[PDB]
Design an enzyme around this catalytic site. Structure first.
Site, PDB file in Angstrom:
ATOM      1  N   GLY A  15      39.700 -31.893   0.485  1.00  0.00           N
ATOM      2  CA  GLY A  15      40.901 -31.327  -0.107  1.00  0.00           C
ATOM      3  C   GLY A  15      41.103 -29.870   0.224  1.00  0.00           C
ATOM      4  N   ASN A  18      43.592 -24.352  -4.635  1.00  0.00           N
ATOM      5  CA  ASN A  18      43.079 -23.108  -5.226  1.00  0.00           C
ATOM      6  C   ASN A  18      41.538 -23.082  -5.192  1.00  0.00           C
ATOM      7  OD1 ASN A  18      42.979 -24.993  -7.833  1.00  0.00           O
ATOM      8  ND2 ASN A  18      41.845 -23.124  -8.346  1.00  0.00           N
ATOM      9  N   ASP A 131      38.056 -23.066 -15.977  1.00  0.00           N
ATOM     10  CA  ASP A 131      38.992 -24.091 -15.496  1.00  0.00           C
ATOM     11  C   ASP A 131      38.534 -25.507 -15.758  1.00  0.00           C
ATOM     12  OD1 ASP A 131      41.444 -25.030 -14.572  1.00  0.00           O
ATOM     13  OD2 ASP A 131      41.002 -24.665 -12.452  1.00  0.00           O
TER      14      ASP A 131
HETATM   15  O1  LIG Z   1      39.869 -32.572  -6.725  1.00  0.00           O
HETATM   16  C1  LIG Z   1      38.918 -31.828  -6.799  1.00  0.00           C
HETATM   17  C2  LIG Z   1      39.147 -30.322  -6.753  1.00  0.00           C
HETATM   18  C3  LIG Z   1      38.167 -29.595  -7.728  1.00  0.00           C
HETATM   19  N1  LIG Z   1      36.844 -30.185  -7.460  1.00  0.00           N
HETATM   20  C4  LIG Z   1      35.936 -29.578  -6.636  1.00  0.00           C
HETATM   21  N2  LIG Z   1      36.134 -28.325  -6.158  1.00  0.00           N
HETATM   22  C5  LIG Z   1      35.272 -27.772  -5.289  1.00  0.00           C
HETATM   23  C6  LIG Z   1      34.185 -28.507  -4.779  1.00  0.00           C
HETATM   24  C7  LIG Z   1      33.351 -27.812  -3.705  1.00  0.00           C
HETATM   25  F1  LIG Z   1      32.409 -26.993  -4.238  1.00  0.00           F
HETATM   26  F2  LIG Z   1      32.768 -28.706  -2.872  1.00  0.00           F
HETATM   27  F3  LIG Z   1      34.207 -27.100  -2.930  1.00  0.00           F
HETATM   28  C8  LIG Z   1      34.054 -29.860  -5.184  1.00  0.00           C
HETATM   29  C9  LIG Z   1      32.968 -30.845  -4.774  1.00  0.00           C
HETATM   30  C10 LIG Z   1      33.115 -32.062  -4.199  1.00  0.00           C
HETATM   31  C11 LIG Z   1      34.335 -32.884  -3.978  1.00  0.00           C
HETATM   32  C12 LIG Z   1      34.369 -34.236  -3.988  1.00  0.00           C
HETATM   33  N3  LIG Z   1      35.582 -34.677  -3.782  1.00  0.00           N
HETATM   34  C13 LIG Z   1      36.438 -33.663  -3.576  1.00  0.00           C
HETATM   35  C14 LIG Z   1      37.820 -33.749  -3.329  1.00  0.00           C
HETATM   36  C15 LIG Z   1      38.500 -32.529  -3.159  1.00  0.00           C
HETATM   37  C16 LIG Z   1      37.797 -31.294  -3.197  1.00  0.00           C
HETATM   38  C17 LIG Z   1      36.406 -31.233  -3.426  1.00  0.00           C
HETATM   39  C18 LIG Z   1      35.744 -32.447  -3.649  1.00  0.00           C
HETATM   40  C19 LIG Z   1      31.740 -32.585  -4.059  1.00  0.00           C
HETATM   41  O2  LIG Z   1      31.461 -33.691  -3.632  1.00  0.00           O
HETATM   42  N4  LIG Z   1      30.841 -31.653  -4.422  1.00  0.00           N
HETATM   43  C20 LIG Z   1      31.532 -30.584  -4.854  1.00  0.00           C
HETATM   44  O3  LIG Z   1      31.060 -29.545  -5.277  1.00  0.00           O
HETATM   45  N5  LIG Z   1      34.923 -30.314  -6.105  1.00  0.00           N
HETATM   46  C21 LIG Z   1      36.654 -31.569  -7.917  1.00  0.00           C
HETATM   47  C22 LIG Z   1      37.528 -32.433  -6.953  1.00  0.00           C
END
Ligand SMILES: O=C1CCN(c2ncc(C(F)(F)F)c(C3=C(c4c[nH]c5ccccc45)C(=O)NC3=O)n2)CC1
EC number: 2.7.10.2
Length: 286
Positions: A15, A18, A131
């Protein structure tokens, strides 16, 4: 725990928002497509101030150790990339929408309890998430969720129990405590407010038609000659709140309303909420 940038093979884009630019990658040092899958966050066209905030996020995640907080794996190139464990079931928001027909109140109470434990642990570390939202919760398995997206997270000052954030950009105002909306004050108790909104999201199965934003926009009325932030503050000040979701147990709605107490000190702590969500999960009579 440095990850070599040449060993991180791009698979697809998880994805862009923000929360940064997140790519699903394979960490393949042997170069045979054997390596583990990881989620890799980067800040695109990031200045020296944004990159300094990123380094701070990385250090918060590195020092966090909870079964209910997404696991930090490492860093790449010291531009800077954050390496996290990959959770393929996606965010809780999408999971609830998709499996609504087979997820009962006890399963929703199990997730609530896990988020609450993760948040209790976060608070003991004097960190404010800022958040909490179903979008920012990841599904590890059917009976296991983890708090994610630490892009806004702050460590509290050693001598203060609140953090004043003076930063440019848009806020998810319909998830925010009134002291956050009015004076940019954030604390463990403003995280409790957002947790009440997470409870509301879970019990609406993240239905987009009655989302926190859709509900508050409807509550504002037909008149739109006043900016939304001013109208939202008026609504909250006069005691208006998100309604009880259809089929939400009366006691779960009572916990939401307590999370939405106008005074931050009147809101319960994550310590006090946890055993109550566990009790509600058991199905026992009170
Ligand atoms: O929709 C959202 C947006 C907010 N969110 C999220 N934001 C940042 C991360 C990052 F640290 F990897 F950048 C992760 C993250 C995934 C994600 C898994 N699926 C997604 C989808 C979109 C973005 C990030 C991830 C992971 O596996 N381990 C993580 O830390 N998640 C939950 C999903």
């Amino acid at each position: 725990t440095i990850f070599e940038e040449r060993h991180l093979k791009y698979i697809s884009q998880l994805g862009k928002g923000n929360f940064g630019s997140v790519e699903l990658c394979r960490y393949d040092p042997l170069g045979d497509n054997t390596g583990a899958l990881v989620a890799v966050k980067q800040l695109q066209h990031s200045g020296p101030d944004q990159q300094r905030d990123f380094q701070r996020e990385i250090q918060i995640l590195k020092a966090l150790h909870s079964d209910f907080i997404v696991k930090y794996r490492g860093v790449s190139y010291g531009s800077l990339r954050l390496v996290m464990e990959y959770l393929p079931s996606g965010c809780l928001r999408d999971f609830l929408q998709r499996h609504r027909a087979r997820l009962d109140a006890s399963r929703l109470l199990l997730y609530s309890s896990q988020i609450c434990k993760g948040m209790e642990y976060l608070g003991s570390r004097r960190c404010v998430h800022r958040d909490l939202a179903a979008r920012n919760i990841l599904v590890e398995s059917e009976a296991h969720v983890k708090i994610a997206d630490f892009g806004l997270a702050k460590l509290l000052p050693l001598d203060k129990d609140y953090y004043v954030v003076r930063e440019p950009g848009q806020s998810p105002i319909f998830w925010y405590a009134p002291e956050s909306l009015s004076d940019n004050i954030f604390s463990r108790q403003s995280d409790v407010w957002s947790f009440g909104v997470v409870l509301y999201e879970l019990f609406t199965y993240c239905d987009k038609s009655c989302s926190p934003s859709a509900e508050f926009l409807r509550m504002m009325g037909c008149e739109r000659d006043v900016p939304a932030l001013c109208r939202l503050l008026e609504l909250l000040e006069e005691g208006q709140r998100l309604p009880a979701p259809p089929a939400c147990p009366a006691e779960v709605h009572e916990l939401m309303k307590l999370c939405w107490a106008p005074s931050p000190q009147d809101r319960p702590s994550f310590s006090a909420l946890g055993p109550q969500l566990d009790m509600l999960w058991s199905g026992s009579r009170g």
